[PDB]
Every structure is written in structure tokens, then in C-alpha cells.
Ligand binder design. Structure first.
Ligand SMILES: [C]N1=C(/[C]=[C]/[C]=C2\[C]=[C]N([C][C][O])C3=[C][C]=[C][C]=C32)SC2=C1[C]=[C][C]=[C]2
Ligand SMILES: [C]N1=C(/[C]=[C]/[C]=C2\[C]=[C]N([C][C][O])C3=[C][C]=[C][C]=C32)SC2=C1[C]=[C][C]=[C]2
Ligand SMILES: [C]N1=C(/[C]=[C]/[C]=C2\[C]=[C]N([C][C][O])C3=[C][C]=[C][C]=C32)SC2=C1[C]=[C][C]=[C]2
Ligand SMILES: [C]N1=C(/[C]=[C]/[C]=C2\[C]=[C]N([C][C][O])C3=[C][C]=[C][C]=C32)SC2=C1[C]=[C][C]=[C]2
Ligand SMILES: [C]N1=C(/[C]=[C]/[C]=C2\[C]=[C]N([C][C][O])C3=[C][C]=[C][C]=C32)SC2=C1[C]=[C][C]=[C]2
Ligand SMILES: [C]N1=C(/[C]=[C]/[C]=C2\[C]=[C]N([C][C][O])C3=[C][C]=[C][C]=C32)SC2=C1[C]=[C][C]=[C]2
Lengths: 61, 61, 61, 61, 61, 61
């Protein structure tokens, strides 16, 4: 009897954001850039979970 | 008896965003750039979950 | 009898953010840059969880 | 020579707002109620200016 | 020669607001209530300026 | 020669606000209530300026 109803798991609510940038410049040469990740919710059952992961390079040879 | 109703899992609600950029420039030479990810919800059952993942390059030879 | 209802696990709510940058510049040469991660919630059952992870490079040869 | 160009007078820009109210109730009996005034700009030349003014009653007899 | 350009007078910019009220109730009997005034800009030349003014009642008889 | 450009007079910028009220109640009987005034800018030339003024009542008879 899981009558307990209001289960909130991995929830994002009530967000307000403002950004004012006169000049935004990104230069990437053989790498990884992750910019501006906002209001991201995730719920993973029996698995991994990755948010905003940046890896330059994996050689593995 | 899972009478517990209001189950919220991986939910995003009530978001307000403003962006004012006079000049946004992105230069990419052989890499990965991820910009501006907003209000993303995900729910994965028995699997992985990735949001805004940037990998430069995987050689593996 | 899990009548205990209001379970909040991995929740982000009620956030306000303001950013004013006259000039934002990012230069990346063979690495990993993670900038501006805001209001991220995650709930992982029986798995790993990574948020805003930056790895330069993994050679492993 | 008023070459000075960028004149901003009575300006509102870059606003983000979120409101979550499970129950909002207003009861008024012979009065004045002003609720929820957001992002209002005004520019009056040679005159008065009023924003969100509430007056109960003016008898003046 | 008013070459001075960037004149900001009565300006509101870059605002973020969040409100979470489970129950908001207002009861008014012959008066004045002013609630929730946000991000209001005003510029008055040769005149008065009033923002969020509440007057109960003016008899003046 | 008023080459001096960047004149900021009566400016409000870069504000972040959060409010969490489980119950807000206002009862008014023949008076004036002013609640929640945020991020208000005003610039008055040759005149008065009033922000969030509450007067109960003016009899003046
Ligand atoms: C430019 N780059 C490079 C460069 C490189 C260089 C090098 C490498 C290596 N080495 C040794 C071993 O590793 C060297 C050496 C010397 C010089 C240079 C170099 S790599 C890539 C790019 C771009 C895009 C993508 C990718
Ligand atoms: C992105 N990526 C990845 C990613 C990955 C991630 C991961 C892995 C593993 N793990 C362990 C656990 O199961 C993890 C964990 C957590 C998160 C993530 C992850 S791998 C590859 C890519 C791209 C291209 C190619 C290849
Ligand atoms: C008992 N348990 C569980 C249980 C669980 C249950 C559940 C989960 C999930 N879900 C989804 C929704 O929220 C559900 C649902 C309903 C009922 C129950 C449940 S988990 C674990 C244990 C023990 C030991 C270790 C681990
Ligand atoms: C000289 N003055 C002035 C001057 C003024 C000018 C002006 C004003 C306004 N505006 C509008 C726009 O911002 C203008 C404009 C242009 C030029 C000038 C001016 S004011 C006064 C004096 C003296 C004594 C006292 C007072
Ligand atoms: C209720 N109410 C009133 C009430 C009143 C009462 C009174 C008055 C006056 N007195 C004396 C002289 O003034 C009196 C006296 C005793 C009791 C009461 C009263 S007023 C009005 C209302 C409502 C709405 C609107 C307006
Ligand atoms: C609102 N109100 C008013 C308001 C008023 C305001 C004012 C007056 C005067 N003053 C002096 C200067 O010129 C002022 C000033 C400042 C602000 C406001 C005001 S009056 C009446 C009403 C309603 C109904 C009936 C009557």
C-alpha cells in the first residue's frame, strides 16, 4: 500500500534566468566545450546518468 | 495498491529565460561544442541517459 | 504502508539567476571546458551520476 | 548637435518571472485592489504619470 | 554638442523573480490594496510621478 | 560639450529575488496596504516622485 502519492524525483520547477552578454566567443580546436546548460532534470532507473560532460579526446590505441 | 497518484519523475515545469547577446560566435575545428540547452527532462528505465555530452574525438585504433 | 507521501529526492526549485558579461571568451585547444551549468537535478537508481565533468584527454594506450 | 544617440528613458528589458500559486483569492467590497503589475515602462512629457494606483473611494460632497 | 550618447534614465533591466505561494488571500472592505509590483520604470518630464500608491479614502466634504 | 556619455540616473539592473510563502493573508478594513514592490526605477524632472505610499484616509472636512 504505497498510498504516499506526492513523489517528486528528478524535478526542476520555478526557474527564472536572465543573461546579457555583449559578445560571447568560443574557439575550439580538437576539444570539447559545453556552455549554458539550464533547467535540466533527469531520472534514470538501473543505468548511468550524465549531464554536461566534456571530454577532450580519448586515444586508447 | 499503489494508490499514491501524483508521481513526478524527470519533470521540468515553470521556467522563464531571457538571453540578449549582441554577438555570439562559435568556431570549431575538429571538436565538439554544445551551447544553450534549456528545459530538458529525461526519464530512462533500464538504460543510460546522457544530456549535453561533448566529446572531442575518439581515436581508438 | 508507505503512506508518507511528500518525498522530494533530487529536486531543484525556486531559482533566480542574472548574468551580465560585457565580453566572455573561451579558447580551447585539445581539452575540456564546462561553463554555466545552472538548476540541474538528477536522480539515479542503481547507477552512477555525473554532472559537469570535464576531462582533458585519456590516452590509455 | 545632439549626436548622442543611445538615449534610453523609461525602458524595461530583460525580465524573467515565475509565479506558482495553488490558490489566489481576492474579495473586494467597495474598495480598490491592484495585483500583479509586471514589466511596465512609462515616459510622460509635460504631464503626470501614475502606475498601479489604488484609491478606496473619494466622497468629496 | 551633447555627443554623450549612452543616457539611461528610468531604466530597469536584468531582473529575475520567482514566487511560490500555496495560498494568497486578500480581503478588502472599503480600502486600497496594492500587491506585487515588479520591474516598473518611469520617466516623467515636468510632471509628478506615482508608482504603487494606495489611499484608503478621501472624504473632503 | 557634454561628451560625457554614460549617464545612469534612476536605474535598477541585475536583480534576483525568490519568495516562498506557504500562506499570505491580507485583511484591510478602510485603510491602505502596499505589499511586494520590487525593482522599481523612477526619474522625475521638475516634479515630485512617490513610490509605495500608503495613506489610511484623509478626512479634511
Ligand atoms: C590541431 N590538432 C591537433 C595537433 C596535434 C599536434 C601534435 C600531436 C601529437 N604530437 C606527439 C605525439 O602525440 C605532437 C608533437 C609535436 C608537435 C605537435 C604534436 S590534433 C587535432 C587537431 C585539430 C582538430 C582535431 C584534432
Ligand atoms: C560521449 N561518449 C561516451 C560517454 C560515456 C559515459 C560513460 C561511460 C561509462 N560509465 C560507467 C558507468 O556505467 C559512465 C558512468 C556515468 C556517466 C557516464 C558514463 S563514450 C564515447 C562517447 C562519444 C564518442 C565515442 C565514444
Ligand atoms: C524494497 N526496495 C525497493 C522498493 C522500491 C519500490 C518502488 C521503486 C520505484 N517505483 C517507481 C514509482 O515511483 C515504485 C512505484 C510504486 C511502488 C514502489 C516503487 S528498492 C530497494 C529495496 C530494498 C533494498 C535495496 C533496494
Ligand atoms: C541647462 N539645464 C538643463 C538642460 C537640459 C538638456 C536636456 C534635457 C533633456 N533631454 C532629453 C534627452 O535626454 C535633452 C536631450 C538632448 C540635449 C539636451 C537635453 S535642465 C536645467 C538646466 C539649467 C538649470 C536648471 C535646470
Ligand atoms: C463597511 N463600510 C463602511 C463602514 C462605516 C462605518 C462607520 C462610518 C462612520 N461612523 C461615524 C462617522 O464617520 C461610524 C460610527 C459608528 C459605527 C460605524 C461607523 S464605509 C465603506 C464600507 C464598505 C465599503 C466601502 C465603504
Ligand atoms: C488616484 N487619485 C488621485 C492621485 C493623486 C496623486 C497626486 C496628487 C497631487 N500631487 C502633487 C504633485 O503635483 C502628487 C504628487 C506626486 C505623486 C502623486 C500626486 S486623486 C483622485 C484619485 C482617485 C480617485 C479620485 C480622485
Amino acid at each position: 500500500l504505497y498510498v504516499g502519492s506526492k513523489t517528486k524525483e528528478g524535478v526542476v520547477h520555478g526557474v527564472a534566468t536572465v543573461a546579457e552578454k555583449t559578445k560571447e566567443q568560443v574557439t575550439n580546436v580538437g576539444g570539447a566545450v559545453v556552455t549554458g546548460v539550464t533547467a535540466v532534470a533527469q531520472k534514470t532507473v538501473e543505468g548511468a546518468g550524465s549531464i554536461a560532460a566534456a571530454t577532450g579526446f580519448v586515444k586508447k590505441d
